[PDB]
Amino acid sequence: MSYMNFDPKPLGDTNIFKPIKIGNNELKHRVVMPALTRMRAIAPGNIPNTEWAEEYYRQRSQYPGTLIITEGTFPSAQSGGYPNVPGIWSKEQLAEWKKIFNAIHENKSFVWVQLWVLGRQAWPEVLKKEGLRYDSATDDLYMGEEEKERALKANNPQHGITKEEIKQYIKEYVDAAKKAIDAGADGVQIHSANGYLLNQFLDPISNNRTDEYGGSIENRARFTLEVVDAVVDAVGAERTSIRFSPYGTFGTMSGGENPGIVAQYAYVIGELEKRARAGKRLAFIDLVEPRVTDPFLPEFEKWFKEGTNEFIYSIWKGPVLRVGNYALDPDQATLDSKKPNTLIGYGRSFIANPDLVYRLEKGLPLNKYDRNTFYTFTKEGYTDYPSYEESVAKGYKKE
Amino acid sequence: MSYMNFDPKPLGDTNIFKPIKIGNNELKHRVVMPALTRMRAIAPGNIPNTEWAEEYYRQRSQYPGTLIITEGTFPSAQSGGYPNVPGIWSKEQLAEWKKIFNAIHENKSFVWVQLWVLGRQAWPEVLKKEGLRYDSATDDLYMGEEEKERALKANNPQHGITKEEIKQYIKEYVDAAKKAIDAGADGVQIHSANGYLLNQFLDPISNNRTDEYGGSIENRARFTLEVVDAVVDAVGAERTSIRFSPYGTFGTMSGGENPGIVAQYAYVIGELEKRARAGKRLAFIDLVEPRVTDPFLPEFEKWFKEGTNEFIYSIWKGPVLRVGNYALDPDQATLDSKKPNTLIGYGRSFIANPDLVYRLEKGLPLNKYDRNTFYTFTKEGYTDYPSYEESVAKGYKKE
Ligand SMILES: Cc1cc2nc3c(=O)[nH]c(=O)nc-3n(C[C@H](O)[C@H](O)[C@H](O)COP(=O)(O)O)c2cc1C
Ligand SMILES: Cc1cc2nc3c(=O)[nH]c(=O)nc-3n(C[C@H](O)[C@H](O)[C@H](O)COP(=O)(O)O)c2cc1C
Ligand SMILES: O=Cc1ccc(O)cc1
Ligand SMILES: O=Cc1ccc(O)cc1
């Protein structure tokens, strides 16, 4: 129960507090809550939590005109494998989502459902129980020895998905997207980052396929672009977005130590820009910064300093969300925000600060997060972080 | 006979005046003379015109420790097609180049031969007269209708070179490189920019081949990388460099309006870094700035402001030469030179100022260039531009 140890600076006079249109939505400011997995969903139906989640999103959407991106949400059972993450395919899931979306909308804020497909990050023993596959780009590229052992113990070995299985995932992204928007979501974000399934195709470290979905930049990007084009066909580009982590190592991805990694992302993003010029553009592209190559490590650890995301601005001409260690670095937030149509995301600091937008605007101290309750099935560390005024009444101080 | 109309600033205390090792050469400063076609060579035989050219290069190398890159120089007759541009394949050419290199070395300066292969930019009647092909990546993608008629009038229609003929060009780059080094050059620069033959393979606008030399990023880069690897094998990576122009439109190239551009160069530059890390690092990569999309246009005209070359610094960890409209913008030169191992090239202003280095160091007025004599077969506008003291004696004033 203390404040992050830094000197806060007000952002209210920077471009962070300038309004911007993102697809259909008229944002009042550029402080975004990125996708944050919390593990409060109810098992066995992957149901958004009925007692606690509406309050959690209600709190963090309190500042009018905020973009909220939901926790990663599975578009089908085969996409999942964590029981306490929500899904968005079933009627009982959708019923609960609608209440969440309503709370955010009642705040005059916006909600975007992140569509998350795990691939090899999934727990294969959990999948096995449900008669589901342990999927990736290849049979044989395990993300590590422990994961390989877990898969073999479960008798659910890693499976390089087929072209038909690829089409099936495509159908499930589309299905979940239509369902999300029908239930009242403003848009959906395709998760193509952090070493999950689409990223597993993007990165040569995890994809040495010799069909059309591996062996070249264009082929590695194919699955991701089919997903984008199918979701766009179904709900429109204005209601679609995507997330990449060019410099990420989490999930046993390449990161910037492979000098060919920038070209991969330059290509896929250039393809999205091509599509934008030909018609309606994707609402935004979300990039994880090299500031955070692995979100399990504390701020400023494994900050890749030898490469940046600046290349995007020479390719994509629409809004760009940037996320990674900004809470502690208002100076860098302010600098990045001077670039055209740039939104700044705050992850761990939004977990800890329900009224983050206001604190950022006024340069107030930020609550420190409690890592212990990032992923516990608890109200504690979810909806009981105080507002600023409450932190002062409790005598909070720098850790 | 006037100065450029701008406010000069001294650069002597910036990074531009710090020494740096480039290949085998200890540069005293980072002001570079890039390649500049002047068309003073003797026809027939493409013979360097030592009677005029020795003095031109002596003048511009006067400041000890300067890197000079020659005018584009043909590595073989079939590479050519401009009768007053020099070659470096023949005994009689080499005998003249030896004298020019000597003069530069007497100044304790350095000289790098730009190896220039024209492809479709060539004049097809001039090649036809010599019994030579008019070459490109394809038989049918002409740089324009004027140029197409010209080729058909000369019964030398464009020709997409075959793998055998590509191998022949590679052989010629190797041959001309060994020859150039043997005559005393410090290095060679492979010209892969400004809409010439290699750039014609890199850009989809001039290359819709469906063999291994086009149809993808890796394919389109293949000829350029083969040239690099051959030359490096023949003369060493420390005597090898390359030039690109990602944002160039000169030569009917795509430039930045094609959003796939950046990926193409990130891919080629990442491949060059992979080579470096395996122990064969090119001496430097030379990039034309988006500041000058077409060097036939006045400074500040057709400045592509929607894209930058900053992506290089996330990929290549070797020296970078950057060129384009720097004379008139010492603030931008200074800023760009703060990036690691960055050299600043000056083209039109080096044409006009024999003692440009000194004038940059001290913040002195610069002579204005006269385009009229860029390509005339004369000493006027070549060797008669005045030193600073001489311009003061003649009462020069701003344009
Ligand atoms: C507890 C936790 C859960 C996260 N869950 C998600 C997720 O569901 N989807 C996703 O794309 N990124 C997720 N991330 C990554 C964040 O959105 C973000 O990119 C990262 O935490 C760096 O930003 P920050 O330094 O502001 O926290 C998560 C990070 C943490 C710490
Ligand atoms: C008259 C003239 C001749 C040129 N010749 C060459 C050449 O042989 N090779 C080359 O790579 N670029 C050539 N360039 C391009 C220059 O090297 C340079 O990229 C361009 O002029 C922009 O830099 P600047 O604004 O300092 O002139 C030429 C430019 C001009 C104006
Ligand atoms: O649970 C942590 C987490 C991190 C990144 C993601 O993309 C998803 C989940
Ligand atoms: O003569 C102009 C010229 C421009 C760019 C080049 O690369 C070569 C020549």
Pairing of the two strands B284-288 and B240-244: parallel
Q: Is B346 a catalytic residue?
A: no
Give the burial string for B337-350 (b: 16+ CB within 10 Å, else e). Answer: beeebbbbbbbbbb
For A311, the closest chain B residue by CA position comes to B311
Classify domain A1-399 by CATH number: 3.20.20.70
Between CA B195 and CA B244 the distance in angstroms is 10
CA distance linking residue A271 with residue A267, whole number of Å: 6
- What is the distance between the alpha carbons of residues A18 and B234, in angstroms, rounded to a whole number? 57
In this structure, the residue with its CA closest to atom 13 of ligand 1 is A36
A interface test, pick of B271, B308, B315 with most A CB neighbours within 10 Å: B315
Long-range contacts formed by A303-307: CB under 8 A, 24+ apart: A304/A247, A304/A255, A304/A256, A306/A256, A306/B314, A306/B317, A307/A246, A307/A247, A307/A256, A307/A262, A307/B314, A307/B315
Distance B101 CA to ligand 2 centre (A): 20
Ligand 2, pocket-test mutation among B60, B113, B194, most atoms within 8 A of CB: B194
From B63, B196, B247, B265, the catalytic residue: B196
Q: For residue B347, say whether it is annotated as part of any ligand binding site.
A: yes
Q: Where are the domains of chain A?
A: 1-399
Q: Which ligand is nearest to the CA of B191?
A: 2
Atom of ligand 2 nearest to the CA of B291: 25
Question: What's the farthest any 2 CA atoms get from each other in chain A?
Answer: 62
Distance between CA atoms of residues A285 and A204, nearest Å: 22
Q: Which atom of ligand 3 has the smallest separation from the CA of A72?
A: 8
Q: Which of B225, B305, B314 to mutate to test the interface with A (most CBs of A within 10 A)?
A: B314
DSSP letter (8 states) at residue A287: E
Q: CB distance A311–B307 less than 8 Å? A: no
Cβ <8 Å between B266 and A314: no
What residues in A contact B316, CB-CB < 8 Å? 259
Q: Which residues pair with B18 in a beta bridge?
A: none
Sign of CA dihedral A334, A340, A341, A342: negative
Pocket test for ligand 1, best of A46, A121, A348 (most atoms within 8 A of CB): A348
Only one residue has tokens 């006067």, namely B62
Amino acid at B86: P
- The answer to whether B333 touches B344, Cβ cutoff 8 Å, is yes
Q: Is A37 in the pocket of ligand 3 (CB under 6 A)?
A: yes
Is the CB of B191 inside a 6 Å radius of any atom of ligand 2? yes
* Residue bearing tokens 């070395």: B105
Residues A339-357 as b or e (16 or more Cβ within 10 Å = b): eebbbbbbbbbbbbbbbbb
Do residues A159 and A169 lie in contact, with contact meaning Cβ atoms separated by under 8 Å?
no
A 10 A CB-CB count for B379 gives 15
Alpha-helix residue ranges (DSSP H) falling in chain A: 53-60, 91-106, 124-129, 145-153, 163-183, 197-202, 217-220, 222-235, 261-278, 330-337, 348-352, 356-362, 388-393
Q: What secondary structure letter does DSSP report for B237? A: G
> Contact at 8 Å (CB) between A66 and A357?
yes
Q: What is the resolution of this structure in A?
A: 1.8
Answer yes or no: do B217 and A267 touch at CB < 8 A.
Answer: yes
Cβ within 8 Å, pair B263-A263? yes
Closest Cα to residue B160, out of B107, B213, B95?
A: B213
CB contact under 8 A, A274 and B256: no
Token pair in block for residue A154 = 């479960």
B369 secondary structure, DSSP code: P
| Identity of the amino acid at B305 | K
**Residue A320 in 3-state DSSP?**
strand
B66 lines ligand 4 (CB under 6 A): no
Q: How determined?
A: X-ray
Are the C-beta atoms of B217 and B211 separated by less than 8 Å?
no
